[PDB]
Design a protein around this motif. Structure first.
Motif, PDB file in Angstrom:
ATOM      1  N   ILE A  18       0.827  -1.203   0.000  1.00  0.00           N
ATOM      2  CA  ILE A  18       0.000   0.000   0.000  1.00  0.00           C
ATOM      3  C   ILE A  18       0.865   1.259   0.000  1.00  0.00           C
ATOM      4  O   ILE A  18       0.575   2.222  -0.720  1.00  0.00           O
ATOM      5  N   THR A  31       4.949   8.810   9.735  1.00  0.00           N
ATOM      6  CA  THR A  31       4.158   8.314  10.854  1.00  0.00           C
ATOM      7  C   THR A  31       5.040   7.841  12.002  1.00  0.00           C
ATOM      8  O   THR A  31       6.060   7.182  11.785  1.00  0.00           O
ATOM      9  N   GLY A  92      -4.677  14.520  11.979  1.00  0.00           N
ATOM     10  CA  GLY A  92      -4.912  14.155  13.364  1.00  0.00           C
ATOM     11  C   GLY A  92      -4.240  15.019  14.408  1.00  0.00           C
ATOM     12  O   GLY A  92      -4.862  15.348  15.423  1.00  0.00           O
TER      13      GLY A  92
ATOM     14  N   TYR D  19      -6.655 -10.211   4.067  1.00  0.00           N
ATOM     15  CA  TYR D  19      -6.931  -8.779   4.118  1.00  0.00           C
ATOM     16  C   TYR D  19      -6.850  -8.161   2.726  1.00  0.00           C
ATOM     17  O   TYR D  19      -7.729  -7.389   2.325  1.00  0.00           O
ATOM     18  N   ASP D  36      -1.169   5.534  15.526  1.00  0.00           N
ATOM     19  CA  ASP D  36      -0.880   6.374  14.368  1.00  0.00           C
ATOM     20  C   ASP D  36      -0.551   5.516  13.154  1.00  0.00           C
ATOM     21  O   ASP D  36      -1.009   5.798  12.041  1.00  0.00           O
ATOM     22  N   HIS D  37       0.245   4.462  13.348  1.00  0.00           N
ATOM     23  CA  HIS D  37       0.569   3.568  12.242  1.00  0.00           C
ATOM     24  C   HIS D  37      -0.680   2.851  11.747  1.00  0.00           C
ATOM     25  O   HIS D  37      -0.905   2.740  10.537  1.00  0.00           O
ATOM     26  N   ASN D  40      -2.912   5.380  10.014  1.00  0.00           N
ATOM     27  CA  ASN D  40      -2.309   5.736   8.734  1.00  0.00           C
ATOM     28  C   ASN D  40      -2.508   4.621   7.714  1.00  0.00           C
ATOM     29  O   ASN D  40      -2.730   4.882   6.526  1.00  0.00           O
ATOM     30  N   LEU D  41      -2.405   3.370   8.162  1.00  0.00           N
ATOM     31  CA  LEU D  41      -2.585   2.229   7.271  1.00  0.00           C
ATOM     32  C   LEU D  41      -4.013   2.148   6.741  1.00  0.00           C
ATOM     33  O   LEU D  41      -4.224   1.909   5.547  1.00  0.00           O
ATOM     34  N   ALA D  44      -4.798   4.700   4.063  1.00  0.00           N
ATOM     35  CA  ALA D  44      -4.121   4.399   2.806  1.00  0.00           C
ATOM     36  C   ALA D  44      -4.943   3.431   1.966  1.00  0.00           C
ATOM     37  O   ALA D  44      -5.031   3.576   0.741  1.00  0.00           O
ATOM     38  N   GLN D  45      -5.546   2.429   2.610  1.00  0.00           N
ATOM     39  CA  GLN D  45      -6.371   1.463   1.891  1.00  0.00           C
ATOM     40  C   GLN D  45      -7.577   2.137   1.247  1.00  0.00           C
ATOM     41  O   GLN D  45      -7.908   1.862   0.089  1.00  0.00           O
ATOM     42  N   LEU D  47      -7.972   5.297   0.321  1.00  0.00           N
ATOM     43  CA  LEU D  47      -7.583   6.151  -0.798  1.00  0.00           C
ATOM     44  C   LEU D  47      -7.315   5.324  -2.048  1.00  0.00           C
ATOM     45  O   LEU D  47      -7.655   5.740  -3.162  1.00  0.00           O
ATOM     46  N   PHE D  48      -6.697   4.153  -1.885  1.00  0.00           N
ATOM     47  CA  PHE D  48      -6.419   3.296  -3.032  1.00  0.00           C
ATOM     48  C   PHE D  48      -7.709   2.798  -3.673  1.00  0.00           C
ATOM     49  O   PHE D  48      -7.816   2.734  -4.903  1.00  0.00           O
ATOM     50  N   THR D  70      -6.534  11.428  18.661  1.00  0.00           N
ATOM     51  CA  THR D  70      -5.906  12.053  17.497  1.00  0.00           C
ATOM     52  C   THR D  70      -5.604  11.029  16.412  1.00  0.00           C
ATOM     53  O   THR D  70      -5.797  11.303  15.221  1.00  0.00           O
ATOM     54  N   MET D  73      -8.954  10.108  14.917  1.00  0.00           N
ATOM     55  CA  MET D  73      -9.566  11.218  14.191  1.00  0.00           C
ATOM     56  C   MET D  73      -9.088  11.298  12.747  1.00  0.00           C
ATOM     57  O   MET D  73      -9.795  11.851  11.896  1.00  0.00           O
ATOM     58  N   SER D  74      -7.892  10.776  12.456  1.00  0.00           N
ATOM     59  CA  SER D  74      -7.365  10.805  11.095  1.00  0.00           C
ATOM     60  C   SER D  74      -8.318  10.129  10.119  1.00  0.00           C
ATOM     61  O   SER D  74      -8.547  10.628   9.011  1.00  0.00           O
ATOM     62  N   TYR D  76     -11.544   9.736  10.542  1.00  0.00           N
ATOM     63  CA  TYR D  76     -12.780  10.508  10.470  1.00  0.00           C
ATOM     64  C   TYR D  76     -12.659  11.642   9.459  1.00  0.00           C
ATOM     65  O   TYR D  76     -13.571  11.872   8.656  1.00  0.00           O
ATOM     66  N   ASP D  77     -11.542  12.370   9.492  1.00  0.00           N
ATOM     67  CA  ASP D  77     -11.360  13.481   8.564  1.00  0.00           C
ATOM     68  C   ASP D  77     -11.332  12.992   7.122  1.00  0.00           C
ATOM     69  O   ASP D  77     -11.998  13.557   6.248  1.00  0.00           O
ATOM     70  N   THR D  78     -10.560  11.938   6.855  1.00  0.00           N
ATOM     71  CA  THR D  78     -10.471  11.416   5.497  1.00  0.00           C
ATOM     72  C   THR D  78     -11.802  10.844   5.024  1.00  0.00           C
ATOM     73  O   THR D  78     -12.149  10.976   3.846  1.00  0.00           O
TER      74      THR D  78
END
Ligand SMILES: Nc1ncnc2c1ncn2[C@@H]1O[C@H](COP(=O)(O)OP(=O)(O)OP(O)(O)=S)[C@@H](O)[C@H]1O
Ligand SMILES: Nc1ncnc2c1ncn2[C@@H]1O[C@H](COP(=O)(O)OP(=O)(O)OP(O)(O)=S)[C@@H](O)[C@H]1O
Ligand SMILES: [Mg+2]
Lengths: 191, 314, 216, 190
Positions: A18, A31, A92, D19, D36-37, D40-41, D44-45, D47-48, D70, D73-74, D76-78
């Protein structure tokens, strides 16, 4: 586990992760805590994308809690040396180093989400050592602290006194407040 | 069927004016013309190699720099047959049997060999092997005896004479390495990888019996101006057959050169803009219109409009 | 033994009406028809290349959107044969031998070649190499001499010179990138990515030879 | 260890993780402590998959047990920013951020299981330090807490005062009761 994704070409289909597939589109993903190895990887992605297409603009997603200041300098210096204009988008929260790298982005392309967060705090220099050693080491943080304030001041445009007054203690800035302060130019507009 | 010894006065004039003639047709690339003309002079002078060809040259350079034009024009200037063998077809080891012929007892033995028969029929000729790199590496082994011994045996045992043949091989192997953009804060050196590629592509023995390896440099802006003039002359010859005439302003030529100038694509884009800008508008008029007869075409450009202004007054 | 239209240069009525006839048959590809018609007009006006083909065209666009209809109708209007070859079959390294022909001493030598025989039998024709992108790189190398020189030597040694034929190659490389939007939060300008993708898929030597890349 | 499933492609079959193979089916398995990781992961899925089809929605099975707001929330925003809505199928434990993220799903496409439980509570962080520092942390933490209650109330449509009263103390809401409250449209048909 990193999810696998497929792409298509006339020759066939290749299997990529990804992050790599998204990195093919010039989208970086910063990150976690800032480590020397981490920073080395981030700068490497920038140098690779610079050669691939200088005309296009990179998108450094800065979502981190901060870390060692030295590591960030490599990212900050790399973000400027390359010909493309790096776009920094917070997802975030933005920490001390995260905020500095956020403001370091090219003016006119910085963006933030409606519920993003920001934070800037004075660097921590708590350690125990010899009396003579403490003075030499303590002198260094003053120069870096003033240096850090000056760099953000140039990007933000606020006077040095404004940065010194605000940085006296920990401060948090919301997404709308960030644009008002000048850390970023505008909020992320709908695609 | 080879040039006679004790060269005559008429032939002498051609040899001294050969370089000048080739430079006019192919601008730039002076080193390539100097190597071909000097080798021919030595062979006619009697100082040529006793059992090797006149000259074995590898022309490695960017696309559109005239690697094959210098060879095609050379044959026209010397009035010798052009033995042009495309090496794209000989991309596999099995294709070697086509050049030297199939061995006895196998199909196609009667057909013979294209390379051996061609050289036998035309002892004095220019052997042009285009896209030599694209051919299988094993095919290069056949050329070793030709460059050193000057003879290639056929399936029937017939030996060809390559002493008068001019072996010229064109390749774009190093173009990819030079054009590729390096990665890093400091720009990496260039023009070194191109030579390394030839060494990797061709064995040391192959590069050890080569008279020279001429590198064709990228066409400069000044050279492109001459290239545009050359293409205009070809169009003028075609129009003369129909009786039409074409005149192009000097300003228009400079403008057209900048529009199509490309370092990577060399001179070929110039033909494309000439076709679209000049041939396409004239095509409609030539078939039906004023240009049907009389011609007297005049072409100029308007600075404010920045577009061509064609004129047709039969 | 041809319709006699091509031999007669004075019969220019077809060329002027070629665009109108083609435009009624195919809709939405007027730009492609205009480029195709103008190219043939210059070829018939005496401005054609002395040794290169009449015109090398790379039909890049969406699949099924009027790409092969212009080719079949053009042959009927110009009174020339239509040579259609499927490049999906020619995707292996050794498939190239089928077109050029196997060399002496190998199976298939008797067969002159699918492409070489067709052009020799029909010097005036339309060569439709559909799905060119699928073709092996070896096939692309053979086409370089076709555009630059105009002749493909066969196994028997006969020069398969075809400078009168019009070469059309159908590909779908560009339609892919333009149809698919960018990835990431902020949208990216992909107007020029289609041309860059075509540049990567096709070697510069092949692209430089092409007269024009039609767009659908 | 993960399974190896052989998907069918024109050129040849390619092995893939469970997965990844289900990601082809617009499935984005969200699970484990919010990080956060991890956050972030997950983004990314999504968006692809947006490139694959903008009109089709992107499934989302959430089993998160809660974590840093926080990081969560990443997503939620996306989610709001992306054109294709997300079907938030809650099949397990839904903590404050998990339930909050679950509520983020577009109306008419959300889902929840009756067997599962969904709880919403205020985030609690035991920050320690100087009195002046605590005051600063108290300001921002209350501010973000108000932001979470205001954005959450916006999608459900219920009065903000009601949501604030319920979140004052730790409480659990049954999955069928959640439908009446408005957290989700309705439980799975079958
Ligand atoms: N140096 C040059 N001077 C003048 N015209 C040139 C020159 N190079 C190319 N041209 C023009 O471009 C035409 C085609 O050039 P080519 O002979 O195909 O070039 P090339 O670099 O030998 O090609 P390859 O072998 O395919 S890389 C010539 O017939 C000329 O019209
Ligand atoms: N844009 C178009 N204009 C006119 N007829 C069309 C168009 N697109 C498809 N057709 C018709 O499609 C019929 C079926 O031919 P096909 O080969 O399946 O399609 P095609 O578009 O001609 O070519 P490809 O190879 O599919 S891109 C033709 O006989 C045409 O009449
Ligand atoms: Mg050539």
């Amino acid at each position: 586990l990193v999810p696998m994704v497929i792409e298509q070409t006339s020759r066939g289909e290749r299997s990529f992760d990804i992050y790599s597939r998204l990195l093919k589109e010039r989208v970086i993903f910063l990150t976690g805590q800032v480590e020397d190895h981490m920073a080395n990887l981030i700068v490497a992605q920038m140098l690779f994308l610079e050669a691939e297409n200088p005309e296009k603009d990179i998108y450094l997603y800065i979502n981190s809690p901060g870390g060692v200041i030295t590591a960030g300098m490599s990212i900050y210096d790399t973000m400027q040396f390359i010909k493309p204009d790096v776009s920094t988008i917070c997802m975030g929260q933005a920490a001390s180093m995260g905020a500095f790298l956020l403001t370091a982005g090219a003016k006119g392309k910085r963006f933030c989400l409606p519920n993003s967060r920001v934070m800037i705090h004075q660097p921590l220099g708590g350690y125990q050592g010899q009396a003579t050693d403490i003075e030499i080491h303590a002198r260094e943080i003053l120069k870096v602290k003033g240096r850090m304030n000056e760099l953000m001041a140039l990007h933000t445009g606020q006077s040095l006194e404004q940065i010194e007054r605000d940085t006296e203690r920990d401060r948090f800035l919301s997404a709308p407040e960030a644009v008002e302060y000048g850390l970023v130019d505008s909020i992320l507009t709908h695609r | 069927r080879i040039p006679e010894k004790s060269v005559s006065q008429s032939d002498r004039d051609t040899l001294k004016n050969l370089g000048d003639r080739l430079k006019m047709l192919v601008f730039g690339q002076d080193k390539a013309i100097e190597a071909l003309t000097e080798a021919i002079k030595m062979a006619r002078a009697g100082l040529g190699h006793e059992h090797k060809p006149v000259g074995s040259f590898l022309f490695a350079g960017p696309t559109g720099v005239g690697k094959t034009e210098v060879t095609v024009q050379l044959s026209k200037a010397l009035g010798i047959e052009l033995l042009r063998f495309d090496m794209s077809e000989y991309m596999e080891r099995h294709t070697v049997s086509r050049l030297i012929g199939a061995p006895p007892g196998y199909v196609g033995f009667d057909q013979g060999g294209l390379l051996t028969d061609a050289v036998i029929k035309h002892p004095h000729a220019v052997l042009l092997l285009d896209e030599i790199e694209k051919a299988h590496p094993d095919v290069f082994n056949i050329l070793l005896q030709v460059m050193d011994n000057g003879t290639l045996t056929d399936n029937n045992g017939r030996k060809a004479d390559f002493r008068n043949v001019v072996l010229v091989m064109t390749t774009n192997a190093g173009v990819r390495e030079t054009e590729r953009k390096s990665i890093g804060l400091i720009h990496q050196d260039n023009s070194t990888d191109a030579m390394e590629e030839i060494k990797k592509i061709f064995t040391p023995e192959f590069r050890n019996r080569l008279d020279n390896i001429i590198w064709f440099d990228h066409l400069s802006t000044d050279v492109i101006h001459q290239v545009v003039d050359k293409f205009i002359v070809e169009l003028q010859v075609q129009l003369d057959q129909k009786g039409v005439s074409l005149e192009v302003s000097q300003e228009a030529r400079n403008w057209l050169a900048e529009k199509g100038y490309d370092r990577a694509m060399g001179a070929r884009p110039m033909a494309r803009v000439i076709q679209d800008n000049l041939k396409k508008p004239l095509a409609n008029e030539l078939l039906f219109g004023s240009l049907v007869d009389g011609g007297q075409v005049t072409v100029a450009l308007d600075k404010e409009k920045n577009e061509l202004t064609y004129g047709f007054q039969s």
